[PDB]
Ligand binder design. Structure first.
Ligand code: RZX
Ligand code: MG
Length: 180
């Protein structure tokens, strides 16, 4: 059975957007970072290591606005033990109606593929936002490309992507804009 429960009533009419974490919304690292947005302690084989998390610019405006426009789902290749605490801390608005992690990805030809068909949502109303063209090899026509973000604090891509999602949020069939 499908990766998601049935949409709640607030969410059923909306387009479902699958959103990536790392290098899409945040960039985390084991190397200490000086003025970090948050620091997550992560237990790895019994030893706690600090993870230094930087937020991509305009991520707050971005997530609060997508949480309105869409049934937003976090879908990352990372492990819950790291991604859940990052989410609790980023997601100030209850934007993510679900969280999917490494076990929900398909490992295909050495890549973590987000298989939109296991989602349980009509595919004409599913979008995937990911820095990584491989996570959507199976659904290239459901995808909004975004560049990988590491630390460039002049980045404006989340802000610049918003009027396009504003338009997508209203169509009956995303393929009518993307093209399948
Ligand atoms: C001591 O290093 C061993 C790493 C074990 O993996 C873990 C475990 C917990 N947390 C993290 C933090 S995160 O930066 C991260 N992003 C990733 C993207 C792809 C694959 C693994 C990833 N891991 C990682 C990478
Ligand atoms: Mg990524």
């Amino acid at each position: 059975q499908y990766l998601l429960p049935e949409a709640k009533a607030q969410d059923s009419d909306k387009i479902c957007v699958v959103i990536d974490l790392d290098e899409t919304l945040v960039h985390s690292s084991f190397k200490p970072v000086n003025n970090a947005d948050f620091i997550i302690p992560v237990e790895i084989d019994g030893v706690v290591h600090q993870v230094y998390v930087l937020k991509r610019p305009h991520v707050d405006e971005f997530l609060q606005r997508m949480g309105e426009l869409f049934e937003c789902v976090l879908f990352t290749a990372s492990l819950a033990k790291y991604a859940d605490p990052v989410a609790d801390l980023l997601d100030k608005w209850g934007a993510f109606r679900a969280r999917l992690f490494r076990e929900s990805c398909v490992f295909h030809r050495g890549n973590y593929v987000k298989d939109l068909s296991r989602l349980g949502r009509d595919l004409r109303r599913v979008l995937i936002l990911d820095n990584s063209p491989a996570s959507y090899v199976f659904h290239p026509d459901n995808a909004v490309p975004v560049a990988s973000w590491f630390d460039n604090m002049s980045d404006t891509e989340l802000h610049d992507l918003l009027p396009f999602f504003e338009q997508l949020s209203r169509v009956d069939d995303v393929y009518s804009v993307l093209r399948q």
